[PDB]
Design a protein around this ligand. Structure first.
Ligand SMILES: COc1ccc(S(=O)(=O)N(CC(C)C)C[C@@H](O)[C@H](Cc2ccc(F)cc2)NC(=O)O[C@H]2CCO[C@H]3OCC[C@H]32)cc1
Lengths: 99, 99
């Protein structure tokens, strides 16, 4: 699909058997999801944004279906205010910016 | 231009007579620039991101040339770690997401 930006670019994702809404975020290097139950091992990490830093759990090789496109990669889980699909996954679904 | 997302989508902007680099950020509602000297009057504001909130100065009706495209609108100035072009200006230069 082609998505204009008059509204937030939200998509429906399926991850860990659950359905969520997430922002397609070209400004985010990594993918960061609100607290949720994800299976398996993880490593603690700290990531920085506009207001400071948050502690997240880093999960590798996680499968996500983003608007019907499958991708596998790192997903950070923690106290983000919004679910964010970052560039590590946007590249896998072939997402580009155009103007 | 079409921009893929294997690297940060940075562009050159001209604002208030100065040249800067800024991130095209579909995840950002508003445009937020690192501390810089802008001429006009302003209004204090607070904005929230992944790690909390920052205090910014709001400047309205600011002209920005973004990769050679002109736009006029609200620019926030304050302690953001990176210059962000948000959707309020991305729409004016016709920027879209495609996958
Ligand atoms: C290494 O991996 C990372 C992955 C993500 C982030 S990051 O902090 O999330 N960030 C990076 C920016 C600062 C370069 C992505 C950005 O898109 C963010 C995404 C987001 C959206 C909504 C939120 F509530 C919180 C975060 N935008 C945002 O801070 O927005 C503020 C200001 C603009 O205007 C408004 O827009 C919405 C809120 C206001 C860092 C590292």
């Amino acid at each position: 699909p082609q998505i204009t930006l008059w509204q937030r670019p939200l998509v429906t994702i399926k991850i860990g058997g659950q359905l969520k809404e997430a922002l397609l975020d070209t400004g985010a290097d990594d993918t960061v999801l609100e607290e949720m139950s994800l299976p398996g091992r993880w490593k603690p990490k700290m990531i920085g944004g506009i207001g400071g830093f948050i502690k997240v759990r880093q999960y590798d090789q996680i499968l996500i279906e983003i608007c019907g496109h499958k991708a596998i990669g790192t997903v950070l889980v923690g106290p983000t205010p919004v679910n964010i699909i970052g560039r590590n996954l946007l590249t896998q679904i072939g997402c580009t910016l155009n103007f």
